[PDB]
Homo-oligomer: 511 residues x 4
């Protein structure tokens, strides 16, 4: 695999993983270190549609023996994976900093979510409870059982390259399904390694198949199209709303219920009675964790009129102190580069859209360069795509207010009272995360039952969901599916209702 | 006006509590006797469905904020009202869709059972308290209503099947727009009025009558593209369901799709033969074979094939058919509508064309083509000869759903072949095996791909408090009835509460 | 049954209900209207031990067919009971005012709890879920089923003569058990009628047997002793801690897990930031609902130092406005008589104990009489035993502070800060109900996780539990059992674990 | 010192993390070979148990406030540590209680499985969110720790059975005082030390060694009368359990009582005979018949009685017995202690006195009374002849638990009689039926009165993630393992939160 020596490590070359075998087939892509594009992390192929087809048929093959492997034994594989992930946590952390450019602290947390998920589902092997149910008839018994769905197609983003895939891969295999996985082209090395750790843990060959490639016009699109050929009994997607709508459509006509974890425009409310320094810290972290490249990153800070001016002042002071830089050379930075050029490009355009609709720019000068330097940048800002922390004031109903923009940007909006804060908080197409900073029980309550969101934080950030709560969104952010904990079991199994007669006669129900 | 076997009712849509007689007039004739006109009613245009959805959005605000236990009290009232009206609804159902008094009473009883189940669900709807990984922090999950639910239903179970959707939908705090089958408009209107009597606020349930394709049904599905529905629920054909799933999917709706079946019933060499014959017979000819769960194929183990066939044909020959309002002792009555009659007529042609062996049945029962155990006048409506084929796996009669009184026999040899043949259909709704060997029941149970399996019982007659639904072409994973339907009409809201006065970073 | 005409209704005479038959056997007791002891409500016999024995054997007989009656059909009986209770609600309300002296409003609520319980368990007939569980072996399946225990002995107090018995009787029969019930001698008529409503609903004869009589030295004691003869597979008790300890002991040696719902000394905290008028109203109602004759009645109001004087002043103003009287002639009163002479006697003594240990009496002059009248009494205070509203100031560690006293009394205690409020709130032998009035999220939280109680109210009274939450106490208030909702199913069933082999070979688990 | 087959360990009590060598010295000798001294250790007096409970009360304050997911991480560490130590614990268990390496490994594996189960339970422990009947109000339930748990355990499953109590007890935030069996002090000490290595804070687990009656066990039970325990959990004899239940009851404690069995195994005329023989044999002689779940009575259907007896005695005759440390291929080794040996000797006398027919067995295996398939020196310890009787229902051998290698055959005629006879014992722990007729398995399953029933499987070998416990004389309703044990170590806290700024009266 070690094809060349790179700058901050080896340049790895590797192929697809199908039925346990490595398949170096298709035109070569490459992944460059986004903190320093001179460092080439990986060269890897684009799987064509026919190879994805073969991966799904290999998955169908392996599913027969895996689904008949007792769930507690399947759980033992995940238990091995906990220990292996634990052993590899420092290595995976360093590789993640290199390949997607998040800080060592955040990368360790990303890996830890996969460890937590592995442990949770390791013992789920001795749970997976169905029901015994009393019949309305004598000499008859009723049962429900959870059954595996079959072959699961999984397509994932690369902003959480270990955590987010683990939310799908782990419960999928634990419930007895087999998997074809198309990872983000932003994190091919991490994905390959994760697959190999599953292998070391004892996952049978072909239960997990990995096909690398792009999205639109590439492997991703081709994999979605294969739902039309009956090769997938389930589909799970993390990514943009735009792509999610199409995947939902294709899934829908093939009578598949897909897991769709899509975008957000996450509101964070600060009421007049908030602990101001706590709220500032929470807003700041909500905005600039991962350089604002989380589904759950804050979109709009809604600030109660009586503290607006004072909150703005302290918020801008806190934003000004943000360290930015190459996190492999400067692990103390708050955030590093854009993960890829797409996020950078859309973020650059948000400045033009903001100016065109009359948003007021309070802070930020676009791309950080030698020519346009940022006072708290550490290292060489031209080796990658890095963004100025960016703060606007905006009105509701504008594009900056309603549309998701990955990258280090945030809006301030003035609201007056709890009723207006809730109405404005709900004035986007999205409904993923949400937060309110307040001390009045009644205000926390009203926000909690008035917001339309999958997730709400009280005196906490829009980011940082605990790994054992149901994760997902409403409105444009999802379709109702949830990941993590017991709530994800509905995504990867179906209910089998069984009635058993012993009465030696035909008894007619409700008659 | 007065009709033949009762009143001819005229009525309109129910929108925001008001009756709206707007649109071209349709009618529903008694399928046992076309001279009896049951109902005249309008076809809602797309714009009126639009208004119904907006009225639903309006009413949802106060209904979702009505405490769940009070919502449950409305359903409790509905139990008592349904109880009171059971004989009336039974008689009207015999008249309007042509099923027997016995089956119609059972249909109504399912709605009563559903009402009672969800009446106390008002004091349940459990979410979770969950321990945080942090000190001074607490985690919660809550079930929240989705919003406005669009419901489209078939008319073969005109009270039961709609109750499976309407009742949990309103109990969980949603509001509803309902497009009932044009085969059962009167029952649907009445059911809506009973909800009203029970105390359901005006606009929480809106009913828009009309057709399906090129009519109210289709227009209602299209309105998902305008953002007017947060949920959609459908009971009907796979072909229509695929389209509804597609439209729902692009609008990020998770729809309930309860679709067709081709339900296998296996009889192993060791079965109680007379029990299995009775079960196969009832699976086939209950409701004249017009259930989603009606048996499609009887798979008979080689050593008892000849003996089972002989007794099965003797039992089929004894089937009484007729107008169930004049002859309530009949096994089944007419086709519910002309579509089922037409597709049933075609199955004979397709059967002959692919070389299936016709053992019994001569198509439509007429004065000229009479059935020996018909009671009454077979030309007052569309009635079908009981029909039995022998078929091969992989053929159209074997794989494709055919509503109406038909069934196939197939010879299998041993449990492994019975399971493989049982799974050789696009469908996966109901299923059954007759056997006494624990090991054979077990292998069928874990080898079949179906939402529902009966051991020594019919493919029909699901109990109202088990999860109902199918896999493959029969559904998308959603389940109705019991606790399992709550996932269909609510979403999970995860809440974390900090008290530690500092920002604690998870994982 | 109509033996004589009484003052406010008929004087009823009736016997025990055993195997469906009425048995007029034993020395006659009588129940006098506690608001007016000239009104004789009922004459009824004391069942001797041998008749209780026969009732248990009749229960054992009926249990065979009842346990084999499908749970959904058993639920239909409870559904009939909902409708019958509904029909009889005005009648049961009036009879309850007459027989135990609570207000029409409270009596209607008492009956409504039985209606709510009936409805809840009516549909529980189609639930009672056990589990399907995956085996660690191939060709093997695991199951759990809830099974009825057998014959349940139930002994109940009379302060909640319909509600509290319904919490036991209804889930007991729904889960397929049969019952012997010894009602309080304070509410024999209500109990007889309730049994007859079960009969009208379709409960088979002998599934519910009712044996009337006393407690110590009488039917109650004899029924507890029959646990030593193997006649009860379950026991459920509502009453005093003193009696509960003995019942727990007898149950314990016979390997029965009893439901024990015992006394309380329920703390209600008012913090400096409380809505004062809300807290005063809540404390007032906690103290004087049912004339302070609830398990959950407030024992001690713990008032934060900065609002102590102001709270006292408003609390005494509110206590002074309390109406007291015969609730059958004056349904607007807050409370009526003591239910029986025992409660009156113990309450009279609490004055002497209070004086002896130096508690400061702020309000109350003992029994209300013509000679010692109460300014807001309505009617004739000598026709029954009525109590002055009573308010003390006490110190922690005293008898008035730690010991339950049924009747209209309450203590004020000064506390300083949340830590002290919690420590003082926990300084009793009891742990049933509890409450805090506050607006600071952090204070509500600390009380909630610091208190040792089965039940906690935030900005609500210690009384008024909703009928579908788990009800019960810790410490001297109970043994861990809970009533109501799904939580009571553990009380009346046992788990049956079943494993089914199909593999035709002996597979050794964990080996 | 060095012993014969390993080190002789000396150690004291573990209280607040410190080792306390205080009290008269006891010793545990290798029951396979009395010359091998495994351990010397003290008898804790009542006052030291008192101190252990107060140290537990102290440590509980910080442990209960440790977030459940962090508590789960300690158990996760324990999984890995138990895994690492499995061969060592296996060898020590063979030495200290005399079970075979295979069974000892399984014993340890149950603790590993329990550890893993409750490791992730740290992120579960679900309570409920519940809808109020009022506006502007919310309802919650939370699981809370009970406090200080007293645990007393037998030594026939010296790692498994204690793990069923210790692990969920600490995971749910309780603290523990543990009095281990004097038959397994070394294993118990080591297990406590592994908890310590895993990161369990000092004083959360305290271990006090000593005897039972007139010793540390009895004194610990008496301390319930001083208010020092909020929970008690016991595994052992019914006679002791009744007393513990009594003491617990007057102190308003709900105790876990896992007591004896007289476990019936039915073989119907249609059973796979060789499977049933193997299952009966293993049910009887696993652990030398020293399991709570060991078969008490084989109930054999009349038509196969003679043939089953013949094959059963052939299988019993092939049983290897011996020192399992020198001969790991043996089926079973010695009696674990002298009490089991004594009660087993008495069962022969009682059997003869009431007229039971002895088919096989000659009492203690000695040089003078040798057993043909004994391996090694039978005088180094207490070893028993495999023993088989024929008995009548209602006799003492039939109804009373007898630890050790003995079993009864009883003739029954038909399923109804098999069930009635199976229930004719004071006990109700485990049970089994061998049959192929679905209807017979069903009737046994719903007719038996037992906590646990096996169909075509042994009375022994319960899987670690099903609820374990008994009815009648075998227990009080409590269950161990899985989610079902959480009721044993927590209590429900119901919380209602008002936001409506006014007093709303319920019902």
């Amino acid at each position: 695999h070690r094809k060349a020596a790179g700058k901050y490590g080896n340049t790895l070359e590797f192929g697809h993983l199908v039925g346990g075998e490595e398949v170096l087939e298709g035109p070569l892509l490459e992944r460059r270190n986004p903190s320093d594009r001179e460092d080439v992390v990986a060269r890897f192929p684009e799987a064509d549609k026919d190879l994805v087809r073969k991966a799904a048929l290999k998955a169908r093959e392996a599913f027969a023996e895996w689904s008949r492997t007792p769930a507690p034994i399947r759980g033992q594989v995940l238990f091995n994976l906990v220990k292996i992930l634990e052993r590899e946590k420092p290595t995976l952390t360093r590789l993640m900093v290199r390949e997607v450019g998040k800080t060592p602290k955040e990368a360790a947390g990303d890996v830890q979510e996969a460890i937590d998920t592995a442990l949770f589902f390791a013992s789920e092997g001795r749970r997976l409870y169905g029901q015994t149910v009393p019949s309305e008839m004598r000499d008859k018994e009723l049962f429900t059982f959870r059954r595996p769905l079959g072959v699961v197609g999984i397509i994932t983003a690369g902003n959480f390259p270990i955590a987010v895939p683990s939310w799908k891969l782990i419960p999928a295999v634990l419930t007895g399904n087999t998997v074809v996985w198309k990872p983000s082209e932003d994190a091919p090395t991490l994905s390959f390694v994760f697959a190999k750790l599953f292998e070391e843990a004892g996952l049978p060959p072909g239960v997990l198949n990995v096909v690398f490639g792009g999205g639109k016009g590439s492997t991703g699109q081709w994999m979605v199209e294969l739902m039309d050929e009956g090769l997938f009994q389930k589909f799970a997607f993390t990514g943009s709303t735009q792509v999610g709508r199409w995947i939902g459509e294709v899934a829908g006509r093939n009578l598949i219920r897909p897991t769709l974890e899509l975008g957000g425009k996450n509101p964070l409310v600060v009421m007049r009675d908030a602990d101001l320094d706590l709220a500032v810290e929470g807003a700041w972290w909500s905005a600039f964790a991962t350089g604002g490249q989380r589904c759950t990153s804050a979109g709009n800070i809604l600030v109660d009129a009586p503290i607006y001016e004072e909150f703005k002042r302290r918020f801008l002071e806190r934003v000004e102190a943000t360290l930015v830089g190459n996190p492999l050379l400067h692990p103390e930075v708050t955030y590093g580069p854009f993960i890829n050029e797409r996020f950078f490009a859309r973020w650059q355009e948000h400045y033009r859209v903001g100016e065109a609709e009359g948003a007021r720019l309070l802070f930020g000068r676009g791309r950080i360069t030698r020519e346009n330097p940022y006072p708290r940048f550490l290292g060489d800002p031209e080796a990658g795509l890095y963004g100025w922390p960016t703060v606007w004031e905006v009105r509701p109903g504008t594009r900056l207010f309603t549309e998701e923009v990955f990258g280090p940007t945030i809006n301030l909006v003035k609201v007056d009272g709890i009723e207006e804060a809730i109405a404005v908080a709900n004035s986007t197409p999205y409904g993923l995360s949400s937060a309110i900073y307040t001390n009045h029980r009644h205000w926390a309550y009203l926000f909690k039952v008035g917001i339309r969101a999958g997730m709400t934080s009280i005196n906490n950030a829009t980011v940082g969901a605990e790994a054992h709560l149901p994760f997902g969104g409403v409105k444009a952010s999802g379709n109702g599916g949830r990941e993590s904990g017991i709530w994800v079991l509905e995504e990867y199994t179906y209910w089998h209702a069984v009635n058993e007669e012993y009465s030696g006669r035909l008894q007619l129900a409700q008659m």
